[PDB]
Design a protein around this nucleic acid. Structure first.
Ligand SMILES: Nc1nc2c(ncn2[C@H]2C[C@H](O)[C@@H](COP(=O)(O)NP(=O)(O)OP(=O)(O)O)O2)c(=O)[nH]1
Ligand SMILES: [Mg+2]
Ligand SMILES: [Mg+2]
Length: 342
DNA sequence: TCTCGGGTCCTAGGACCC
DNA sequence: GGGTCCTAGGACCC
């Protein structure tokens, strides 16, 4: 009853495609992200820039303090999508059991695949080669019997490598595995678990499920299962998008509704075009708005509504702006829809 | 350094249905 | 009293 899962993850994705496309970027530190005047964060960085401490999600101000020669790119989304499509077309050559998690990443279930004497190890290696040939980009991969461990596997010899975990290896692997490396356990959760004296999967194995259920709910069952190596989640292939949103962060906090309103007018065309792309009639389940203040509270107002409408989005943004700003500057405005179900 | 924009899934109270 | 819808927010991931 053992499956074979591969997680494939491109290396330094956005930056890899920039450096391929312009090689003077290879050995100098670069990153894709908004400028510090635009109040941006880093989307990603290349290895020369990570060496200085630059990471995804870091404020751009902080990146340039740390790495003052940082060349900042705005990023070219069609180029990244062109590459993404090609790599999924490549995965398709080996199986149809494909679950993408982003542009750069996917799970494959190759249990019932006959491509390299049924070797998951060899299949992954053949996919990383071939991606390298063809795209001149490099990928890493993790091979394992369940999703989470393939994904964790894939970070252990990156860049441009891969790592396998056999069922026989799983237990020693879990013993000292930090809970924080499990997907879905982030900062807030890791620190709650540390406070109870739980750092690794090992520690959690010595724990009562019933208590994990009391302290954390469905998530506590997931921890318990994941600590044991249990992950019965199946590679899907049928996932579909459920919402589309658009939001922008102004270089300067804004203080008057005239300014907010001017911001929405710019937002709405972008949201209408993105939504037309997958729903030409513009029919939806709900639409709504979002503001984020000065001090990072953030509220949303969203309701049932049958078709994208600009003025209603302006109405609500007005109410929301009257009723829950209280004199704080606003750093971002956003719009949003929830897509019909089937 | 001062904190993005695209999403996903989980929770939870009161409404509403039976 | 027990489902399921409706809304808002939070944690998380890429
Ligand atoms: N806007 C934004 N984009 C991001 C963020 N994180 C990632 N991206 C975009 C930019 C990334 O290029 C891409 C894939 O994300 P990863 O696989 O998490 N990291 P990469 O592939 O860059 O590095 P590694 O070699 O360690 O895999 O997604 C973020 O916080 N914000
Ligand atoms: Mg990657
Ligand atoms: Mg990824």
């Amino acid at each position: 009853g053992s499956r074979k899962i591969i997680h494939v993850d491109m290396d330094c994705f956005f930056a890899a495609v920039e450096m391929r496309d312009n090689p003077a970027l290879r050995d100098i530190p670069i990153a894709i992200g908004g400028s510090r005047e635009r109040r941006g964060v880093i989307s990603t960085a290349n290895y020369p820039a990570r060496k200085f401490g630059v990471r995804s999600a870091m404020p751009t101000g902080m990146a340039l303090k740390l790495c003052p020669h940082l060349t900042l790119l705005p990023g070219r989304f069609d180029a990244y999508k062109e590459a993404s499509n090609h790599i999924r077309e490549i995965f398709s050559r080996y199986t149809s059991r494909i679950e993408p998690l982003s542009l750069d990443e996917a799970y494959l279930d190759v249990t019932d695949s006959v491509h390299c004497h049924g070797s998951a190890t060899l299949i992954a290696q053949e996919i990383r080669q071939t991606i390298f040939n063809e795209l001149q980009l490099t990928a890493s991969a993790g091979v394992a019997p369940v999703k989470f461990l393939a994904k964790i596997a894939s970070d252990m010899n990156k860049p441009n490598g891969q790592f396998v975990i056999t069922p026989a290896e799983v237990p020693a692997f879990l013993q000292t595995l930090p809970l924080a490396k499990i997907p879905g356990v982030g900062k807030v959760s890791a620190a709650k678990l540390e406070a109870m004296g739980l750092r690794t999967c090992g520690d959690v194995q010595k724990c009562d499920l019933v208590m994990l259920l009391k302290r954390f709910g469905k998530f506590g069952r997931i921890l318990w299962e994941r600590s044991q190596g249990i992950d019965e989640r199946d590679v899907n292939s049928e996932r579909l998008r459920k919402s589309v949103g658009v939001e922008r962060t102004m270089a300067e906090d804004i203080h008057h509704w005239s300014e907010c309103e001017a911001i929405i007018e710019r937002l709405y065309p972008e949201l209408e075009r993105r939504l037309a792309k997958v729903k030409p009639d513009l029919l939806i389940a709900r639409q709504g708005v979002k503001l984020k203040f000065d001090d990072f509270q953030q509220t949303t107002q969203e309701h049932v509504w049958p078709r994208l409408n600009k003025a209603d989005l302006i109405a609500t943004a007005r109410k929301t702006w009257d009723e829950r700003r209280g004199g704080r500057g606003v750093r971002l405005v956003g719009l949003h829809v929830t897509l019909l179900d089937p």
